[PDB]
Each structure stands twice: as structure tokens, then as C-alpha cells.
Design a protein around this ligand. Sequence first.
Ligand code: A1CEW
Ligand code: CL
Ligand code: ZN
Length: 419
Amino acid sequence: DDKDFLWPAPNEEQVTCLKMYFGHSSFKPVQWKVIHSVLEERRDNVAVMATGYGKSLCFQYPPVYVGKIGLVISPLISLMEDQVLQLKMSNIPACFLGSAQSENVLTDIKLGKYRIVYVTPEYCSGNMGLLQQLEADIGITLIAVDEAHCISEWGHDFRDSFRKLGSLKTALPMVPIVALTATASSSIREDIVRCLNLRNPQITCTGFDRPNLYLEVRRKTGNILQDLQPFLVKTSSHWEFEGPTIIYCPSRKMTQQVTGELRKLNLSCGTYHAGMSFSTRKDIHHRFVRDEIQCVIATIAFGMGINKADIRQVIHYGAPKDMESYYQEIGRAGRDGLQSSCHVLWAPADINLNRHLLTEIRNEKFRLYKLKMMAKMEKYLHSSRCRRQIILSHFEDKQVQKASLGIMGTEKCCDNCRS
Ligand SMILES: Cc1ncnc(C(=O)N2CCC3(CC2)OC[C@H](C)c2c3c(=O)n3nc(C4=CCOCC4)nc3n2CC(=O)Nc2ccc(C(F)(F)F)cc2Cl)c1O
Ligand SMILES: [Cl-]
Ligand SMILES: [Zn+2]
């Protein structure tokens, strides 16, 4: 089941509701990440989706399941009308609220007859008083701002109508905003977060094929120089990686061991883990961005807010924590769009394939969740099937796989496609 790899597990009624109103059996990890964070954590989201495949469920499902109201702010008039119609046909009361439509629907919206109200930024700008009445009388499950990049003066498609959506978090400080956009740009994501006044927002990014990322899994010997010598070059009587490199290790001890071996080659490298100070980490982080140090030997702590476009190589030195961590970490490779490589150097020895520490966990559902993820992680590494297929099938909507067939079964896809 998909639900075996979701935390927390969707309850029977959440599944029932999904089948009845949307006609789906399962939530994809990103959808569930966004939906659960809206429902339980009431948490602001920036959800980047290259396309609209699986997009609508993220903002439509929560108000429908709680039976309250969801606001969808968008300038894409015709697509809002199409979704308003598909909702109506699914027995989900929905309307396009605008100045012309007001006389017809506004009383029914104030009375709580609608699950999902689509508005323009222009109309929402003029009616902050209304939304507060809906929050007071009904309770707003979420505000979805689509084409959220239009709030950025620095993007390709600016709209003055998005300026005033900065007020939403003043009018409705307890209501979560789900910002949606097709751009993976780090600076546009920064602009969206600032302009919409989002508070510690959840960042997801899906719909992308990432053809420039190559996937390989090889057995590690354990010996650190033998394992990593294939990744090094000899130039100017010294040693270095091909380009900017992150080596992710399962423990704080391994980051010290791996660095200590690369130190013996005078390789431009630096360590990052929890135990180090924030000044030395901000040095390591700033030296990486300015290309002063070529490698960062990292625990899971190094990752969020790197925003470095030209990471050429990610090495998992040891089996990843799980497919979730693995996905987040390799996704940091090749954000410039240029050819990068993602190699896992794994052994069954590795603590992240060691089932004993899950036989410790006395909380049954959480133990049995952790076992399934450790099992899913082993099944990926043990696989002789296409690695790109496994990761897209797990995390991405089934559309993304159709587009990525080109790269798949070719030299540049993965070790298993090279046959
Ligand atoms: C401030 C801040 N706060 C919180 N967290 C982070 C953070 O550290 N991260 C969040 C975002 C992040 C990377 C990690 O994690 C989710 C997925 C992961 C993801 C991410 C990402 O930053 N980007 N950027 C692209 C671009 C697409 C095309 O143009 C260039 C750029 N795509 C993604 N993807 C999808 C992907 O990479 N999906 C895939 C698709 C195929 C494969 C394949 F290799 F299996 F084929 C692997 C992955 Cl991960 C952060 O920085
Ligand atoms: Cl129904
Ligand atoms: Zn492949």
C-alpha cells in the first residue's frame, strides 16, 4: 500500500472521503505532506509543482474532509471555472466568487453552503472583511494562492493584484496559506515566503524529471579511500572531486573519518554536523557557495537553505536514513540543470538497514512504519530495476514517469539501465 509509507497513517475516514469525493485510493507522499500539515499543523506551504497533475487535491481535499471552507486565489479564470465544474460534478459545493457573481452566491457562502470558493487576487484584495466573517462563522481550512510567483517583482510574470495578499496573514493569522507555483527557483521561493508573510513554511517540489541527475548504487568495501578513489582526479600533484560535492554519512563519527581520509590528499573539503558551532557551519556553508571548499562531508543536518545551483556529485557514504531523506538529499544535486551524479555506497552492515533498533521502538504503529521504510530502502538498493522508475513511482504522480521515459533505459539514466 502507499499508506504503508505515509506518517502519520491516513485514518479509514480520510481514505473513505478521498474515494467518495475525488475517486482515489491513495495519497502520494507530497500530497499527504501538504494535506496533513494543513489539517493537523495548520502550517503554511510553498508547494512547487512543474505541472497541475495531483496539484488540486492538496488545497481541495482539506476543506472537503473537515466540511468547512477553502479559499483558492488564482488569476487563471478558465481553469478555476473548470475545477469549480469538476467539484460540482463530484458533489462538492463550490463557486467562483467575483463582483458579477456576488448577488447569486455571496449569501450562500456566508451561510456556509460552499466547501471551496475560487476568487481573483483583485476581488480578495477588496474583501478582507468577508474572509474574517468566514473564519469567524465557518473557519477557513486553507487559503491556496496559485501562480504565487506572480507576487515576485523578480520573476517572469509579475501581477500588481498579488501585492495586497501580504494582508492575508494580518487578517487571518491562524489560517494556513498554501502558495503554489511551477518554478523551482530558490530566490522566487524566498520572494513568495516574504511577500505572503509565511511562518516557517513547508517546502515541497514535484512534477520534475531531473534528467541531468544520474543514479548509481554500488557495494562499499568499508575502506574509505578504496570506496572514494573512483570519484577523485590527480591534478597539480593534489586531489579533488570532478566538481562541487556533498558526501552524506549516517553518523557524526563517519563525517570525521571520511574528512580525515580526504585531508591526507589535501582535498578542498570541510565537515558539517550538529556538534559543530553555527559560526563554523556558516563559514563552511559560505565557503561552499563561493567555491572556496569543493566538498562538504555532511550529516542529514547540512541540506535546508544551501540553494547551491552547481552541486555536481552527491555521495551517500552508507545507506540513506530512508527514501524520504534520500529524495530530499539527491534533489539538492544539479539545480543548475547541468549533468550531476548521485551514488549510494551501501552495505547491509549500515545502521539504516539494521532492523534491531526498530525492534527497540515499543510504539507499534511507529515501529512498523520505520520497518516498512527500512524495507522500502533495502528493496530500492537491492533492486536490478530502473532506479529513476523506483523513485518517481514512490514520490511523483504517474504523469512524470511518462515524460521521463526518454532519459529512462539509456546510458545517462541509472546503473541498472546501463546493460
Ligand atoms: C529552504 C529549504 N527549506 C526546506 N527544504 C529545503 C531543501 O533542502 N529541499 C527542498 C526541495 C527539494 C530539495 C531539498 O526537495 C524536494 C524535492 C526532492 C526537490 C527539491 C528541489 O530543490 N528541487 N529542485 C528541482 C529542480 C527541478 C528542475 O529545475 C532545477 C531544480 N527539483 C527539486 N526537487 C524534486 C526532485 O528533485 N525530484 C527528483 C526527481 C527525479 C529524481 C531521480 F534522480 F530519481 F531521477 C530525483 C529527485 Cl529528488 C530547502 O532548501
Ligand atoms: Cl458524493
Ligand atoms: Zn534507469
